[PDB]
Amino acid sequence: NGPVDKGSPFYYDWESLQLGGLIFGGLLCIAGIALALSGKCKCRRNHTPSSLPEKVTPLITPGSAST
Numbered sequence: 001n002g003p004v005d006k007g008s009p010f011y012y013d014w015e016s017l018q019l020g021g022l023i024f025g026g027l028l029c030i031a032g033i034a035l036a037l038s039g040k041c042k043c044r045r046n047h048t049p050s051s052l053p054e055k056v057t058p059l060i061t062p063g064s065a066s067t
Helices: 009-037 040-045
Strands: none
Touching: 009 040
16 A cells, blocks of 8 residues: 555656646647537537628628728
């Protein structure tokens, strides 16, 4: 028994907190977008009054800095 881990040499197995640490961030992200999904289905039919007319602005309005 040694919940400390620093008791046996198997403690040096912490290196994972490093290599995995980098993935941790990548994983957290995957978790971030996931939550968004629960808000994408609505944004698909509701979307925003600005983010959506952005790709439809050129067809609805000139979209040119001049002329």
